[PDB]
Amino acid sequence: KLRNVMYYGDWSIWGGQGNFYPKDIPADKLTHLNFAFMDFNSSGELIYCDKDAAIGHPLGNLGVTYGDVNGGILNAFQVLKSENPNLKIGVSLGGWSKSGDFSTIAATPSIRAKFVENVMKFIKYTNMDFVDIDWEYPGDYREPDKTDNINDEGTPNASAGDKENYILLLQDLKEALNKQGKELGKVYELSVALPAGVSKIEKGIDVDKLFNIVDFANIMTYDMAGAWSTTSGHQTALYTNPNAPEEYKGLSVDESVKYYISQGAEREKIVVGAAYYTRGWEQVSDKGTDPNNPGLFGEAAVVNKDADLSPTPGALNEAPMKNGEGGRAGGVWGYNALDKLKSKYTGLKEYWDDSAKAPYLYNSETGAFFTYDNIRSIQEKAKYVKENNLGGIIGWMASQDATTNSTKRDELTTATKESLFGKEDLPKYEIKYTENDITCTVTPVKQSWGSGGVLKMSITNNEKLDESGEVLSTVETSAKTVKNMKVYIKTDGIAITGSQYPAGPVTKEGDYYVIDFGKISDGKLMKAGITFTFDLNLDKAIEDTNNIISIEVSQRMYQTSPEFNRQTIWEN
């Protein structure tokens, strides 16, 4: 079974990525959606990159106020899955900028165990389905590049022990996932992000052992050429053009996959990467390296400067170059910004390298050169996956895809899905939720005056908050809040004519009376430990509860989103 995997960065929601909220992800076209990234410290405690993004932002949902506990990307992912049950949702830990604490965690069994325990709790409270470990990279000594990213940790504590310790970490995670999956009655998966190139693999990836632990592995077959080099090239090519110079030999999807297989990787677990952005160079001279691809593998003149004044051959980026926030000139433009790119760099012509099956843009008069993925190269990558019995495709990243006919950013995502799977719907999966500890009492009220009767009902959220630290306490608080509660009451011969605050309004829907706490501002987010006690009005006085059959409750993340976790709280 193939996979169509997508990264979604938590910073998608701000202006740099055009304020792209999860509801506009084409989730019916994905099998796996990675929340990128969760940080963590050297003691194994999880740490947010952007707390408001993760747990507080309203994300375009009309009834959500900033900071409301049903806000945030993590809750939005749950809604995407409810609305698109083909989808598995998961969490990417680390990434290029937050891999600095892996070496320490992986080296000490007690810290490894704490990290694993915290990740298991996280995915329990967020109802996530997989864990993706993006250790970039084990055994690779690297300092931060604060000009690129003030928050970059690098991997300054890398060591030769990382290769074996990563295997231990992955083994611990998979065993914990197996255990928790059995406890909760669900299937979990474990994935990793892997380097494309041989030297990084040799430094830190025990291929054969790793592939026997993970469910699948995402090969980062992008960023394989760029402004760190003074030779133009393809950054994410399917095949190695035979004219490639030594520095780019090996750095294609095909050669990377073939190397992994030669080292023991199981084909069906290999997911290959597609980049939804350009890289490029300001001023490339055609050296005639490949006469059939002008400008390719040409010499890039060192004519620009980074934000820290370092000379560079890189072209300008879509975003302004600022020290500490995209400070390196890399020719980096989102796929959805190719029209902006062409307005800034005029005179670009589109080329296709038939030997690499990769597009590029080149101005033969100015020398500007950009390398990227398009619909055609993604279709070629998909054909390669199918013909070689590989595992799927991963895209980096969602917010960079282009709109087609709606507000969804889905041009490349749709092309990927249809080339892998065709036009039919993706398989759907059952979604399980853990019932909340919700109890209730019902008490007939003696009313010697007036007409009708009264039933006094109390509903209690018996959950209690135990987790410590910002990450686990916030996801726990959300999970143990009863959200937009609907109460379904089935009676035999008893009519509920009305309801009173703190109850929401009551209606008859089929054989049930339904109380909608989504319509009570004080009742729509019922925190742990809270009780609502309220009067229900009846058409006739009642002396016992014998004609009350059942009371059930359901939740909704938003007033608009699907009901879930329907559970019985009182039965006769």
Ligand SMILES: O=S(=O)(O)CCN1CCN(CCS(=O)(=O)O)CC1
């Ligand atoms: O200012 S914004 O909030 O728009 C972007 C903040 N920040 C910039 C750096 N990237 C690094 C991603 S990675 O290097 O870890 O892939 C994460 C987002």
Ligand SMILES: O=S(=O)(O)CCN1CCN(CCS(=O)(=O)O)CC1
């Ligand atoms: O002894 S050596 O290590 O030199 C060769 C071992 N060799 C590596 C390649 N795989 C192909 C797996 S697959 O093609 O069936 O997926 C077979 C075994």
Ligand code: NA
């Ligand atoms: Na960290």
Ligand code: NA
């Ligand atoms: Na193997």
